[PDB]
Amino acid sequence: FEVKKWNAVALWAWDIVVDNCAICRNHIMDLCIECQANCTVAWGVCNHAFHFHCISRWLKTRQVCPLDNREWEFQ
Amino acid sequence: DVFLMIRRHKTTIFTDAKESSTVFELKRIVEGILKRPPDEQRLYKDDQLLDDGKTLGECGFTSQTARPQAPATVGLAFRAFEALCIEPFSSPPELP
Amino acid sequence: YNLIHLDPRTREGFTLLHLAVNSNTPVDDFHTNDVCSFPNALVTKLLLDCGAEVNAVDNEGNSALHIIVQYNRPISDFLTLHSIIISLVEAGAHTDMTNKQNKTPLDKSTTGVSEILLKTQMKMSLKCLAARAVRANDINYQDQIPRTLEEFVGFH
Amino acid sequence: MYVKLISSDGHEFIVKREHALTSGTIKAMLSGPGQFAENETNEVNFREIPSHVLSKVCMYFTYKVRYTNSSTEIPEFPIAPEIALELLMAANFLDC
Amino acid sequence: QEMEQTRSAVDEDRKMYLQAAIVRIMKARKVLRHNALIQEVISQSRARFNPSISMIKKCIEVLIDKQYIERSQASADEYSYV
Ligand SMILES: [Zn+2]
Ligand SMILES: [Zn+2]
Ligand SMILES: [Zn+2]
């Protein structure tokens, strides 16, 4: 079989491998909840990129990733 | 997407093909681009004859070996077969 | 345009394009902070439309592309970082040329996001690969090449 | 569809026209008077560049056509030390 | 089913807005009474949805576990941060 003509829809998104900051549940383009009213993005060794303030508070609480069980580190 | 450097004396042809495909259409396309009868072309891979129905991926070169870089030293000859006298490329000058 | 065709340079060779690209460019502590943020994609586009030397180098040899890749906030203002690299490459910057330390902007990217954007925007040329091979092997190229190509070996 | 690139030292290199229009100078040579529209030969005489550098620019033509925008893990193109500074001048002449 | 989840998709969206609103208030004066904060967050989140008293109370407890807010040791009604 073949097709004479086709119609499509496509959801373009930026090519960043990370999607969201899973602390404040805010997209990483915008600012964290601690930071909106007044930031930098901190990556991880386990392909974990979140907000700087959120990561700082989380590591002040515990040295564990918020989704898996692995020791946090900077880049 | 296998790549080949089909050589015959001075003449050299750079050809793209598929991993699993016979040499029949290879001989037909070199016939089309060489403007000569098709039956006299005989491909040599390091100076040995190969089957006319066997796929070229299994012949000794694959897409991992025959890259867009230096593909293969595939020689070609025409029946008058002619002796394989593939002219090598000119030697680079003596650098200081 | 008139200011660009005087080639204004700071102490460290920064042209008028480099400072609009740089993130360390000082913005005054007064009300200028609210409106003037460097890097700015509109200023870079305006300067390139007005004829800024997109391949100009500073004292360290870093071109306009070498400074935008070193930007340390690739995701917070990715809209800014994307458009300036598009403008720099479309204006005719070399996505391969090296500074005084022989460091390609891919090597001086220090950021995955900028590296991905630049690798997307690179256009491959045999002249660039050959000149990179010449520079890497330290081949004596003086008085063996065109004079216009000596510069090309100089930065590639 | 297929163009022929005669080197200085006699060697004839045949690559696709789509592959050989990625260099500006060859595109200019094919256009103009004496385009020789036989649709299969389109010969060009490179009386200056030797055989090895012409072979390398043909490999580069294939390499660029294959990797024009794909395969972000781009393989390195193997410039020998003895072919550089003579492939560089050839690439400048061809405006690759 | 699709209508129900979209009514529940905004439920997670307004919890994130309530947490953002509570933190935004808590970084301007750094301490408020428990009853005084509820009327303040409702006033800010008023052009959008009207938050129920039970939902904001749950958002305080979630933010306590997130260590953005914490009850003061001197007075449990007062809210500090950590
Ligand atoms: Zn966050
Ligand atoms: Zn922040
Ligand atoms: Zn993690």
Side-chain angles (χ1 to χ4, degrees), chain A residues 1-46 48-72 74-75, chain B, chain C, chain D, chain E:
Chain A
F1 291 86
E2 66 271 16
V3 171
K4 62 178 72 66
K5 64 181 289 294
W6 189 56
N7 193 359
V9 294
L11 270 292
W12 74 259
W14 299 123
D15 209 9
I16 317 165
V17 298
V18 76
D19 50 40
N20 280 161
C21 179
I23 315 296
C24 53
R25 303 305 313 281
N26 288 319
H27 186 71
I28 302 170
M29 287 307 154
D30 56 74
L31 282 73
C32 59
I33 52 181
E34 180 67 26
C35 190
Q36 282 141 355
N38 52 73
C39 62
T40 50
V41 191
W43 295 267
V45 297
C46 47
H48 271 73
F50 308 100
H51 288 129
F52 180 50
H53 309 148
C54 297
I55 284 298
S56 74
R57 181 164 273 98
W58 190 248
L59 63 88
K60 276 175 52 57
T61 60
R62 66 203 43 84
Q63 73 273 40
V64 175
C65 290
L67 308 94
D68 54 302
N69 293 55
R70 191 261 181 274
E71 209 268 327
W72 183 256
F74 287 164
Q75 293 297 109
Chain B
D1 54 356
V2 67
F3 299 92
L4 289 175
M5 184 187 290
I6 299 168
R7 315 254 304 274
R8 150 72 167 100
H9 270 189
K10 303 288 193 213
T11 306
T12 300
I13 297 95
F14 289 79
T15 300
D16 180 73
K18 265 299 290 176
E19 290 89 2
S20 299
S21 179
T22 184
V23 306
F24 182 79
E25 70 275 15
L26 185 138
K27 290 182 174 65
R28 303 292 80 75
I29 62 179
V30 304
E31 185 271 332
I33 70 187
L34 276 159
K35 285 261 165 56
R36 75 190 320 282
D39 282 309
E40 310 91 297
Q41 282 73 245
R42 186 65 178 171
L43 60 91
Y44 287 163
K45 174 60 187 291
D46 291 331
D47 213 3
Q48 66 183 357
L49 58 88
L50 294 174
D51 291 331
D52 293 22
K54 186 67 176 177
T55 185
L56 82 168
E58 185 49 51
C59 275
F61 53 89
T62 191
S63 53
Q64 314 313 331
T65 301
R67 272 284 76 181
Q69 297 86 297
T73 78
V74 168
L76 185 64
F78 314 129
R79 189 263 184 276
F81 295 100
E82 268 183 299
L84 199 77
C85 200
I86 306 305
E87 302 265 20
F89 299 141
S90 179
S91 74
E94 192 272 331
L95 73 164
Chain C
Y1 182 84
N2 212 348
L3 188 48
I4 290 297
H5 291 348
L6 272 74
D7 209 38
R9 285 217 195 287
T10 66
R11 268 196 209 83
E12 59 273 15
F14 286 165
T15 188
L16 190 62
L17 183 55
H18 288 137
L19 311 159
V21 169
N22 212 333
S23 179
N24 293 318
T25 302
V27 185
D28 190 74
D29 56 355
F30 206 76
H31 282 103
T32 66
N33 289 138
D34 293 331
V35 178
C36 298
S37 65
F38 301 138
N40 189 178
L42 274 299
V43 184
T44 305
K45 180 68 176 177
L46 193 41
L47 289 168
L48 292 172
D49 188 26
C50 288
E53 209 192 337
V54 72
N55 268 318
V57 297
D58 57 355
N59 278 116
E60 212 177 31
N62 303 345
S63 66
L65 211 46
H66 292 65
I67 307 184
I68 192 50
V69 292
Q70 303 171 68
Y71 180 63
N72 44 60
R73 299 208 333 270
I75 302 169
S76 64
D77 56 342
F78 179 84
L79 293 173
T80 299
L81 175 63
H82 168 69
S83 281
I84 181 179
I85 296 172
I86 303 316
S87 299
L88 282 185
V89 173
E90 200 205 331
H94 266 306
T95 58
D96 194 311
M97 73 172 275
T98 67
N99 55 3
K100 295 290 182 68
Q101 315 149 17
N102 294 356
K103 293 176 73 67
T104 302
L106 277 300
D107 164 78
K108 266 182 70 59
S109 196
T110 196
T111 296
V113 185
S114 292
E115 182 177 1
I116 293 169
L117 292 174
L118 191 42
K119 287 174 72 175
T120 298
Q121 266 303 319
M122 287 178 70
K123 185 176 180 180
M124 53 188 323
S125 44
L126 186 49
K127 192 189 290 184
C128 293
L129 312 170
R132 181 209 326 279
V134 163
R135 271 295 276 258
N137 303 2
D138 205 317
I139 297 186
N140 166 68
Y141 53 89
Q142 284 96 355
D143 202 1
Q144 324 293 315
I145 52 181
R147 192 179 332 273
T148 62
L149 192 148
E150 185 177 1
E151 295 292 328
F152 202 99
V153 182
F155 44 78
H156 280 86
Chain D
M1 189 208 176
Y2 274 61
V3 310
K4 188 195 314 172
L5 286 85
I6 294 92
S7 176
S8 55
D9 291 331
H11 289 101
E12 296 178 354
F13 297 87
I14 288 149
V15 72
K16 310 204 200 324
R17 152 174 293 251
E18 161 196 359
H19 285 209
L21 290 178
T22 191
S23 65
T25 290
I26 295 182
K27 191 170 69 46
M29 289 174 139
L30 294 192
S31 67
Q35 69 274 17
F36 192 70
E38 293 293 328
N39 313 287
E40 286 294 291
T41 60
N42 313 65
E43 79 195 79
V44 295
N45 290 318
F46 284 119
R47 276 181 63 252
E48 286 322 298
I49 59 175
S51 313
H52 45 282
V53 295
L54 190 49
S55 86
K56 217 71 194 196
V57 308
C58 281
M59 305 201 211
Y60 164 73
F61 291 163
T62 295
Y63 176 71
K64 183 179 183 293
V65 167
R66 157 80 174 124
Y67 299 109
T68 180
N69 45 0
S70 67
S71 179
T72 304
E73 56 275 15
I74 285 288
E76 63 254 9
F77 184 75
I79 306 285
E82 80 265 350
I83 194 166
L85 212 65
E86 192 175 3
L87 201 68
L88 182 46
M89 294 164 35
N92 188 247
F93 176 52
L94 297 162
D95 271 0
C96 293
Chain E
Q1 168 60 42
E2 175 208 52
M3 185 181 289
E4 189 45 66
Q5 65 181 357
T6 44
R7 191 94 60 168
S8 179
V10 298
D11 196 28
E12 328 291 331
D13 289 331
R14 64 176 63 189
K15 289 180 182 179
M16 300 330 157
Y17 188 39
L18 275 187
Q19 281 157 35
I22 284 157
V23 164
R24 171 173 90 253
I25 300 162
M26 280 299 89
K27 303 291 102 174
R29 279 83 59 86
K30 280 95 174 171
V31 62
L32 289 175
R33 293 199 34 83
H34 171 79
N35 82 82
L37 163 73
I38 300 312
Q39 283 74 242
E40 177 68 278
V41 66
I42 288 161
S43 177
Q44 292 181 356
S45 67
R46 182 63 179 169
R48 281 187 50 146
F49 75 107
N50 169 268
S52 52
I53 309 299
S54 66
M55 186 179 288
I56 310 171
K57 175 182 303 308
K58 183 173 73 175
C59 292
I60 296 298
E61 196 264 354
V62 174
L63 270 192
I64 280 173
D65 186 74
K66 284 269 212 72
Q67 309 285 344
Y68 284 106
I69 196 168
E70 52 160 11
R71 320 187 67 105
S72 297
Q73 275 72 30
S75 178
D77 202 280
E78 304 275 76
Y79 282 107
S80 53
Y81 65 95
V82 64

